């Protein structure tokens, strides 16, 4: 799907639709007596005459402007529009103007300050009067449009309004009507004229009035400032990197454009003319109206890619000289931006994307767009990568050293995104990285030489007093000693206290909303066991029933209103287990509402199985079948039981009949972490089918279900491949994922669970998948895409398992990703940026990990004994 989360809250993820704090200056125009001004958006303000509407399509007029002359161009354009009575609209505030004329907005939606709608007849005089009165006013070229004559007046053929037009005109707001046909309106950085529409005569004259000193081969990245092109200079046949800045774009809140912090970049790269590891400006000049910068193409993959090839994720075998090379890379960075600070040049944006490493370990520092030149002041870092920007308003000389300190901690333990949330997290992971680097077998002199440089970079930064809203989060400096079940119960009670503390503070800040902060992959959902509040309430209940406490006073009312909200929002455009209503009804069954659960399940079973699209356990019919199997195994009085077993038999016959028609049987190409763009593992693939038909075999014994189990194993190990030593991991096209949702940790759970029924030839893979799921460093802490599923696969259904000895490893691994709030624990999900309480990424997955370790059976999926 599409997510519009914002990093505006200091502690939590929040959508931009819930962002309303606008202290910027409001744009306004005078309103005549026979005019009305109406807003029905968060960006635009519509002005229309009384009782006059426009057409549904036609030539719309776009007007762009500067930031300084934007309030006084609105007066001129509104004064023009108040004789030529046309419907025009403009941007709300100055912040909307900056975010529309910024950098990371789409090139087809950018630059539009004022949009006008003359019908067909006032357009000719309207364009002439706007051309006559907009002298001296300049603005960005809008890429989807075409400039009229010389003033910032821009035209396209587009859709004016939504329907109107007698009854409903049988048309939509995305498709135009040319000669009684359906042509879609493409909103792209291009001028699209649909073929066949009658151009007027003056517009026909306007449309009929339509060598570089380099050779551009391709493009690397595109933005509202303009592209970054991989070009080759014609005068030398030498490959460079191009970067353009179309005028009056890249607006920030300082008031600068991309044409100003490009003369700044040219001056910065001219001052640092001869430094090893620094790009050189080779060509700078304006072509038409776009100025171009030719910098030296520094070779090398970025720092995260070099780390992914070179960090000891699993063992020290082969990567036996990592710390010496990382020390050399860090010293190369320190030398480069300390020779840069002698020339009064400050980079102000140092993160893992701005360092490139060669195959011979040579460092290059790029992206000098945000350079400062005069120290002298406590300045604000404008646009910084999260985890690397400075916390306070400091000098330009210390912002680069903070960036170098975070690169130093990145090279020594790759968890940096939580240092922007918890102050002192770089010392929390310092001891963990020391323990990991003495556990692998590294030399003590290499660790000492790394740690001396890191500790010397720690003293080169600024020590401040935390005054922000995220100073309630403290690191875990003291490691807990786990020796008995009381020490495990203390940790579990601290998890339960921190969960309710963070929930109460979220409900304090955001009323009339969700009762729990959730990772941005599931912000605008409240169903299914990955991101819902009901799953967190279930995890809290099974945590209370683990250490035998009582409910936290208002917990019964919280779970009553959560269940009532789930009933009120019980849709049907889903049927999923971990994103929909089968997981919601299994939560309702597990919370203590079993009669209401079987009632509502038998109420919507037929429609909620018939209306479905996918086939996985996540968002396909397998989740419905597994909830029905749990309901008829726990309760043998279901009147809909025969329809459940017949649908399982039909699904089994379809699984034997159709090959590779359930999901993708292959490698794949998607390299993202979105759950809807993954098609493998326990949650998204044939392993969910095997989990369904290894429990259907347990309850309703058939040869067809064991045949489905072996077919699921034989289909799943096609994509699983042997690594360098002994590891079997799934390929997502460009990377390998041993996680519980997409890889080796989900398959081994049912090979170990169904080990008695299954044969020997694919219990032989239990050792090949065992050390492929035991690394030394795991990036995320969650149960699905992280360490708590890696631990659960390694330990659960493995026989002769001690609770205390397993928890002693678990808590020791869990004190890497933890933070302290009140007298409890909180944790950040699969970003590290903001606090999460959900199951698939946040604290409730750890709570369910402890519950599933105590009980011996999973709580993420039904595991009927």
């Amino acid at each position: 799907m599409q997510y519009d989360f914002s990093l505006k809250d200091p502690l939590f993820f929040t959508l931009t639709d819930d962002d309303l704090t606008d202290f910027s200056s409001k744009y306004s125009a005078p309103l005549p007596y026979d005019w009305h001004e109406l807003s029905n958006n968060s960006e635009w303000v519509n002005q229309y005459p009384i009782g006059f509407t426009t057409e549904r399509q036609g030539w719309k007029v776009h007007i762009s402007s500067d930031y300084k002359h934007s309030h006084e161009v609105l007066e001129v354009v509104s004064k023009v529009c108040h004789e030529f009575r046309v419907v025009f609209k403009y941007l709300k505030t100055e912040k909307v103007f900056v975010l529309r004329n910024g950098k990371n907005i789409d090139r087809g939606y950018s630059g539009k300050f004022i949009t006008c709608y003359p019908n067909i007849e006032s357009l000719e005089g309207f364009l002439k009067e706007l051309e006559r009165k907009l002298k001296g006013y300049t603005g960005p070229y809008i890429l989807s449009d075409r400039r009229w004559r010389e003033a910032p007046i821009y035209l396209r053929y587009g859709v004016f309004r939504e329907s109107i037009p007698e009854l409903e005109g049988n048309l939509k707001s995305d498709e135009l009507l040319v000669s009684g046909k359906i042509i879609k309106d493409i909103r792209s950085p291009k001028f699209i004229i649909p073929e066949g529409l009658e151009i007027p005569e003056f517009l026909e004259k306007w449309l009929k009035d339509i060598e570089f000193p380099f050779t551009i081969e391709s493009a690397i990245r595109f933005s509202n400032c303009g592209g970054i092109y991989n070009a080759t200079l014609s005068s030398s046949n030498k490959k460079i990197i191009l970067r353009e800045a179309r005028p009056y774009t890249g607006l920030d809140f300082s008031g600068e454009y991309s044409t100003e912090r490009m003369k700044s970049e040219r001056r910065a790269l001219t001052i640092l003319k001869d430094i090893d590891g620094i790009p050189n400006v080779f060509w700078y000049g304006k072509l038409w109206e776009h100025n171009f910068l030719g910098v030296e193409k520094m070779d090398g993959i970025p720092l995260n890619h070099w780390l992914t090839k070179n960090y000891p994720l699993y063992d020290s075998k082969g990567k036996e000289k990592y710390l010496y090379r990382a020390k050399n890379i860090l010293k190369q960075l320190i030398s480069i931006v300390e020779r840069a600070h002698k020339h009064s040049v400050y980079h102000q944006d140092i993160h893992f994307g701005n360092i490139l490493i060669d195959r011979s370990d040579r460092l290059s520092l790029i992206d000098w767009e945000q350079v400062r030149f005069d120290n002298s002041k406590m300045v604000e870092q404008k646009m910084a990568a999260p985890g690397y920007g400075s916390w306070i308003d400091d000098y330009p000389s210390k912002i680069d050293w903070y960036g170098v300190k975070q690169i130093a901690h990145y090279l020594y333990f790759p968890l940096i995104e939580q240092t922007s949330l918890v102050l002192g997290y770089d010392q929390q992971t310092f001891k963990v990285a020391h323990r990991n680097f003495v556990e692998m077998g590294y030399s003590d002199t290499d660790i000492k030489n790394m740690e001396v440089i890191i500790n010397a970079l720690d003293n080169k930064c600024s020590t401040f007093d935390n005054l922000s809203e995220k100073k309630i989060l403290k690191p875990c400096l003291n490691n807990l000693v786990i020796n008995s079940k009381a020490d495990i119960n203390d940790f579990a009670s601290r998890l339960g206290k921190g969960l309710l503390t963070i929930s109460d503070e979220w409900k304090r800040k955001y009323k009339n909303k969700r009762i729990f902060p959730v990772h941005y992959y599931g912000l605008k959902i409240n169903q299914g066991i990955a991101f819902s509040d009901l799953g967190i309430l279930l995890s809290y209940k099974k945590l209370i029933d683990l250490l035998s406490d009582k409910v936290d006073n208002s917990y019964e009312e919280i779970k009553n209103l959560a269940i009532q909200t789930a009933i009120a929002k019980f849709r049907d455009d889903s049927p999923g287990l971990l994103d929909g209503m089968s997981g919601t009804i299994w939560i309702i069954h597990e919370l203590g509402e079993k009669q209401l659960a079987i009632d509502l399940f038998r109420k919507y079973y037929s429609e909620m199985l018939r209306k479905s699209s996918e086939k996985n356990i996540y968002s396909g019919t397998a989740g419905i079948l597994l909830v029905g199997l749990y309901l008829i195994s726990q309760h043998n009085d279901l009147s809909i039981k025969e329809l459940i077993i017949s649908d399982m038999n039909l699904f089994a016959d379809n699984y034997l009949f159709n090959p590779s028609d359930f999901c993708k049987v292959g490698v794949g190409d998607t390299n993202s972490n979105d759950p809807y763009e993954a098609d493998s593992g326990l949650l998204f693939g044939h392993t969910g089918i095997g989990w369904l038909f290894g429990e259907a075999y347990r309850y309703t014994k058939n040869s067809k279900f064991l045949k489905c189990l072996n077919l699921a194993i034989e289909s799943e190990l096609v994509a699983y491949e042997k690594d360098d030593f002994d590891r079997l991991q799934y390929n997502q096209g460009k990377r390998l994922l041993p996680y519980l949702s997409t890889g080796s940790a989900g398959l081994l759970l049912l090979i170990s669970r169904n080990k008695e029924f299954l044969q020997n030839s694919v219990l032989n893979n239990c050792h090949y998948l065992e050390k492929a799921v035991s690394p030394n460093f795991c990036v995320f802490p969650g149960i699905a895409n992280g360490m708590c599923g890696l631990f659960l696969s390694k330990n659960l259904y493995k026989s002769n398992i001690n609770y205390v000895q397993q928890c002693k490893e678990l808590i020791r691994c869990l004190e890497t990703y933890l933070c302290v709030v009140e007298d409890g624990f909180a944790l950040a999900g699969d970003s590290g940026l903001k606090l999460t309480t959900d199951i698939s990424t946040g604290t409730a997955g750890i709570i369910l990990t402890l519950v599933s370790l105590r009980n011996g059976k999973l709580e993420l999926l039904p595991s009927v004994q």
Binding site: L143, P189, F212, S218, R221, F222, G226, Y229, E289
Partner: peptide, 15 residues
């Protein structure tokens, strides 16, 4: 070269 210049935006490996 208005056009050419603007064509550059319609290259590949975009955004």
């Amino acid at each position: 070269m208005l056009e050419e210049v603007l064509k550059l935006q319609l290259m590949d490996a975009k955004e």
